[PDB]
Amino acid sequence: SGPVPSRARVYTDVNTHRPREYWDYESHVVEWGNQDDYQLVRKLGRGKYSEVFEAINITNNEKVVVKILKPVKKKKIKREIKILENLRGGPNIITLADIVKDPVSRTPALVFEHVNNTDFKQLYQTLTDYDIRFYMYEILKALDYCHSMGIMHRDVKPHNVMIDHEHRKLRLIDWGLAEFYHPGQEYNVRVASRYFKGPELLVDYQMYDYSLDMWSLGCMLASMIFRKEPFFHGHDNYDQLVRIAKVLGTEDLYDYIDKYNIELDPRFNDILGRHSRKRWERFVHSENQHLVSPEALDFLDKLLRYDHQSRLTAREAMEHPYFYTVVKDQARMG
Ligand SMILES: CC(C)=CCOc1cccc2c1-c1c(c3c(n1C(C)C)CCCC3=O)C2=O
Ligand code: NA
8 A cells, every 4th residue: 555654763753852943943033134244255166056155254354154045945944044053063063153134135145154175076085094984973973963953964965064174174064955853754855966865765755764864974985985986876866776776786675665665666667677786895996995894894884775774873873893993093082
């Protein structure tokens, strides 16, 4: 009949136990400031519905980042603001500093702490084995925190991880697709970016949870240790699942589809084929072997699972042997 329901393994009911105001972002009241407190310096980039600038706060002469919002869906503005406010001060989460509107155009804009960034298309080429572990651990702190706060990021990818490599500091940005987890809710599956979409999104299983972010993180890890960007390189959403099935195999895929009684789109009927689950040594060569270890492969394998329930949680991930050296060095504070 219908799809089998599902619930997050961790942090299942945390929003239910909050006051309504925590997650009911539609009724949040915004105190809009004056963008004239800020002078734009230069354009830094763009989002799917935003343009991002370096700016100067002319009151205290501090450098900030201004994100001007022009979304197709409007209530998305209060959602992002409310999620950013709930998460403010959490480890490795971008800090929302102010919320303003241009006095003329009335266009809303978010003001953030400034962070430097090197584009991952030139930074990841220089990361050592240790650096990958260190920064993966920093991302996991951010994800464990926001999951523990009842929030799925739903857009984890290199472009959304700002790294100041000189100061070894990392921030997870762009919370515009983030959402509150509520058990039993059916979410939009047209989230995240193609190369980082979890199988639940590709097969249209809507009752997903925080474990979506852990798939995306596994895609990032695979591209870093194997030096293959992206790791799953699909032409479209349907071929994206084919690329995954050629690596993880079709047996576990059809068991997953069976377990949740998922109705598979007929387009997949003639393109998934039959594929074995490949051993990870198949992707190791002389150019990436210094980043690959038994610990790295054991950790990666535990993130990239079809069944979202069987993926590591962020906190389970942080206890994996792959991070023992980072944990020990963090304790002695170095
Ligand atoms: C120094 C350089 C070149 C980049 C640092 O870019 C920062 C720094 C602090 C804070 C943020 C960004 C940023 C944000 C956002 C984006 N970017 C960048 C990637 C343009 C892209 C769109 C979505 C979004 O939200 C954001 O909140
Ligand atoms: Na983005």
